[PDB]
Amino acid sequence: VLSEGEWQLVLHVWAKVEADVAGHGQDILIRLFKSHPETLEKFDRFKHLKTEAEMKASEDLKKHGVTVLTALGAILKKKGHHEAELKPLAQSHATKHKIPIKYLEFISEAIIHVLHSRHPGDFGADAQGAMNKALELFRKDIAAKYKELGYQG
Numbered sequence: 001v002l003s004e005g006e007w008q009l010v011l012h013v014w015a016k017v018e019a020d021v022a023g024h025g026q027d028i029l030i031r032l033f034k035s036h037p038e039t040l041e042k043f044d045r046f047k048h049l050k051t052e053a054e055m056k057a058s059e060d061l062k063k064h065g066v067t068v069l070t071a072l073g074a075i076l077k078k079k080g081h082h083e084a085e086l087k088p089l090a091q092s093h094a095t096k097h098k099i100p101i102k103y104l105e106f107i108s109e110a111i112i113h114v115l116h117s118r119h120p121g122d123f124g125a126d127a128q129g130a131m132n133k134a135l136e137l138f139r140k141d142i143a144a145k146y147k148e149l150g151y152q153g
């Protein structure tokens with residue numbers, strides 16, 4: 001469980017992210033696709049993008065970035081009490097999109113990378129540690145739903 005102090009460090013930096021959701025969303029997905037090319041193959045709607053310049057130019061990619069970070073934000077603001085928000089997400093990602101838990105670990109790493117680039121002063125080691133905890137909590141609760149459905153993996 002995160003403490004109240006750690007949740008405050010998470011939400012203090014998230015309020016920054018929310019100043020520019022679309023720029024953040026795009027940086028994170030591009031970092032994910034460049035660092036782990038196998039993730040791009042899951043998106044029929046983005047598979048055609050071959051370079052970083054092409055990714056940067058895609059309005060649809062940017063629009064999906066907003067989708068992802070808006071869902072993540074709604075979870076983070078529930079500070080662990082996120083059952084209603086998380087359940088539909090795990091169901092679709094396990095059963096419809098077929099996303100391995102490992103990929104959620106990849107995109108967690110991408111989020112931390114980008115937060116670190118854009119918000120140094122609000123993202124020192126203590127914030128980084130709290131954000132890693134929040135994302136681990138996210139993954140741990142999703143993995144439990146996967147297991148139930150028969151997708152641990």
Ligand code: HEM
Pocket residue numbers: 039040042043044045067068069071072088089092093097099103104107
């Ligand atoms: C921070 C973690 C993630 C969040 C909050 C997230 C959230 C979402 C949301 C809200 C949607 C649209 C509604 C739905 O289908 O559930 C979605 C769709 C999708 N996500 Fe994620 N996602 C996450 C991670 C990933 C990762 C790691 C992959 C692939 C490596 C993935 C692949 C997909 C796919 C394939 C779709 C459908 C895209 C389309 O064709 O419209 N997601 N995600």
